[PDB]
Amino acid sequence: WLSAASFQETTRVLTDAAINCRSDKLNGLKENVIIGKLIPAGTGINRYRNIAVQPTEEARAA
């Protein structure tokens, strides 16, 4: 309902949102842009996001 209320017919969507008492799972490009989360696309999906990088065992003296 958050991705719809920012598209068209803001009042018509917000009215039906509170009547049906809809809950929005914040998982979407347009939704994460509003709340400030990383968009689930590109470098924002959990596959590339949660990645640990460690150096190889070889290293110089200092």
Binding site: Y48, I51, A52, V53, Q54, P55, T56, A59
Partner: protein, 81 residues
């Protein structure tokens, strides 16, 4: 088989995409390692458990992103997807 890459085009974007799975994966690999190198320069004078320092010889006043991008080209790092 190309002219010497100058500036931000070095290391070449083609050889960098060989040690990685996708364009989006290389961004995270370089960025998170650049955070390690940057914390090493800010925790070199104070504190232990400082992040691992630069693996290649860095240039004078070289940016931590450029340092991390060369060592990825030099196969001096690992990964965990």
């Amino acid at each position: 088989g190309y002219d010497t890459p100058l500036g931000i085009t070095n290391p070449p974007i083609d050889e960098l995409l060989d040690r990685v799975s996708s364009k989006y994966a290389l961004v995270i690999y370089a960025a998170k390692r650049a955070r390690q190198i940057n914390d090493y320069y800010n925790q070199l004078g104070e504190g232990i458990l400082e992040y691992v320092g630069p693996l290649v010889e860095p240039g004078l006043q070289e940016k931590p992103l450029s340092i991390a991008l060369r060592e990825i080209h030099a196969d001096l790092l690992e990964h965990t997807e």
